Amino acid sequence: RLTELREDIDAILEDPALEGAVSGVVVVDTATGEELYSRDGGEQLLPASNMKLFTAAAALEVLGADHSFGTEVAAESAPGRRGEVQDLYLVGRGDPTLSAEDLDAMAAEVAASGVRTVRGDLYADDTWFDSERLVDDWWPEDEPYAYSAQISALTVAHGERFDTGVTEVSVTPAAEGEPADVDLGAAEGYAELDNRAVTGAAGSANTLVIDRPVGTNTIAVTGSLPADAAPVTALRTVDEPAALAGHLFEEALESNGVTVKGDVGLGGVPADWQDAEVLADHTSAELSEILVPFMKFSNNGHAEMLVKSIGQETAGAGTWDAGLVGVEEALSGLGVDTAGLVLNDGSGLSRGNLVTADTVVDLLGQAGSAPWAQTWSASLPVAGESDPFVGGTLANRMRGTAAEGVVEAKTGTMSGVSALSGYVPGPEGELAFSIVNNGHSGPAPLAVQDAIAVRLAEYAGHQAPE
Numbered sequence: 001r002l003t004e005l006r007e008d009i010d011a012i013l014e015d016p017a018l019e020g021a022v023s024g025v026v027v028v029d030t031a032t033g034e035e036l037y038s039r040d041g042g043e044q045l046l047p048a049s050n051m052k053l054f055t056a057a058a059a060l061e062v063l064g065a066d067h068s069f070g071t072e073v074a075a076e077s078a079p080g081r082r083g084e085v086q087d088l089y090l091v092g093r094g095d096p097t098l099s100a101e102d103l104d105a106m107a108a109e110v111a112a113s114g115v116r117t118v119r120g121d122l123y124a125d126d127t128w129f130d131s132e133r134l135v136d137d138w139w140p141e142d143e144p145y146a147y148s149a150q151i152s153a154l155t156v157a158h159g160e161r162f163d164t165g166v167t168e169v170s171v172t173p174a175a176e177g178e179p180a181d182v183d184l185g186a187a188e189g190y191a192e193l194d195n196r197a198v199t200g201a202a203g204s205a206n207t208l209v210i211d212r213p214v215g216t217n218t219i220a221v222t223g224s225l226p227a228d229a230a231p232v233t234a235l236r237t238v239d240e241p242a243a244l245a246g247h248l249f250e251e252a253l254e255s256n257g258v259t260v261k262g263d264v265g266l267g268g269v270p271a272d273w274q275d276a277e278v279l280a281d282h283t284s285a286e287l288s289e290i291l292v293p294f295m296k297f298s299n300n301g302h303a304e305m306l307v308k309s310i311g312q313e314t315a316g317a318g319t320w321d322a323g324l325v326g327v328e329e330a331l332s333g334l335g336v337d338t339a340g341l342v343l344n345d346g347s348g349l350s351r352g353n354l355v356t357a358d359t360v361v362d363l364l365g366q367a368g369s370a371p372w373a374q375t376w377s378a379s380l381p382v383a384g385e386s387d388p389f390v391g392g393t394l395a396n397r398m399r400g401t402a403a404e405g406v407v408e409a410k411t412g413t414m415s416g417v418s419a420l421s422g423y424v425p426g427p428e429g430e431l432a433f434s435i436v437n438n439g440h441s442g443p444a445p446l447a448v449q450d451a452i453a454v455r456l457a458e459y460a461g462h463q464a465p466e
């Protein structure tokens with residue numbers, strides 16, 4: 001029954017969508033160790049977001065499924081009878097899921113502890129990680145978009161998916177000929193606005209562009225929005241995430257009765273402070289939780305922030321240089337042969353990352369029997385699942401196929417690079433697969449990937465739901 005499987009994968013990979021593409025395709029039975037299929041299994045290829053497989057596993061080895069993350073507020077000593085302090089410090093230690101509501105709960109504490117006036121300045125301290133915001137080889141033109149957000153120890157995360165280092169922009173039409181109305185979202189009062197957008201007659205054509213020009217903190221909107229259009233929203237990144245955390249904090253403080261009168265900016269706790277009074281603090285959910293929004297939606301910031309967290313754990317240094325050696329070490333300690341690997345970031349954004357399909361599958365079986373196997377597999381998207389927090393980036397793929405509800409896999413797509421790698425649990429054995437595509441001209445070969453994953457589910461003894 002095994003040559004039929006091979007013949008079919010061989011035919012599927014004949015698709016014209018794979019014209020001039022190197023493809024790495026490996027299938028292995030996790031029970032026996034048997035190699036069911038293998039083509040260019042040792043070719044070194046760009047991973048895109050499949051690299052999070054490696055990061056996620058290392059964060060569980062190094063940090064533990066139990067790990068949470070802290071933020072706090074500090075002044076030189078407690079407030080007194082007048083209710084005054086001098087300077088104040090918001091201090092972040094790598095929480096990738098700090099909401100504006102968390103900032104507000106910490107402002108209430110600062111007030112509930114006797115403060116009524118910050119007489120000096122408010123500072124945002126993100127010194128737990130270094131201030132290298134972007135990887136060397138990320139592309140400048142990409143910097144406005146949430147996947148390319150800058151990297152800090154203190155960052156405010158937006159929405160239920162926890163997109164870090166961004167603000168939501170909204171553009172609402174006026175009457176034909178009047179300017180459009182632009183909201184900066186959270187970055188209101190922080191980011192500059194260059195609004196050049198206009199409202200066009202009803203039913204005309206939407207030509208709206210939302211930008212942050214390279215090396216500014218300006219949201220520039222150009223174009224027309226039709227008078228009858230639905231209002232448009234976009235997530236855009238800001239410069240210096242921690243500075244916006246600070247801005248949002250003084251608003252929170254001001255809202256909870258505390259009256260900040262100095263300015264706002266970056267800076268670390270002075271160190272000529274002996275017994276800093278901590279006036280408020282927050283703790284995130286445990287890393288097993290945080291792994292869900294991270295892995296289902298392929299959050300890049302989470303991945304980088306977990307890398308610099310790993311570098312603090314192994315080496316006292318919140319750095320890529322250090323945390324990437326941390327990831328490589330954790331992978332080794334796990335049983336994975338890392339010869340094929342080049343590690344240049346944790347998210348997969350960087351085109352200086354290299355894996356082989358054999359390596360992915362090694363990790364898959366290694367992470368299969370690890371103590372944390374179930375928390376690791378519960379975070380991988382499941383094929384065909386409607387609910388965004390079960391289906392993730394696979395919710396709209398493979399519905400009504402043998403693979404629906406069954407296949408757990410990580411995705412990842414850029415220009416010229418696409419991958420799908422994960423598990424196929426069945427009666428005919430627990431399978432492990434990795435499809436890595438490099439060099440194609442059209443759209444990503446998502447259908448070729450779905451097609452193989454479905455054949456594998458059929459192989460493992462599955463049928464389409466009807």
Ligand SMILES: *C(=O)[C@@H](NC(=O)CCCC[C@@H](N)C(=O)O)[C@@H]1N=C(C(=O)O)C(=C)CS1
Binds near residue numbers: 049139298414
């Ligand atoms: C993972 O692959 C990650 N993707 C990206 O960051 C896309 C890279 C775009 C870069 C430009 N410069 C280009 O070259 O095209 C996340 N992955 C997914 C996913 O489906 O797995 C996303 C939905 C986007 S972010």
Ligand SMILES: [Mg+2]
Binds near residue numbers: 404405406463
């Ligand atoms: Mg089924």
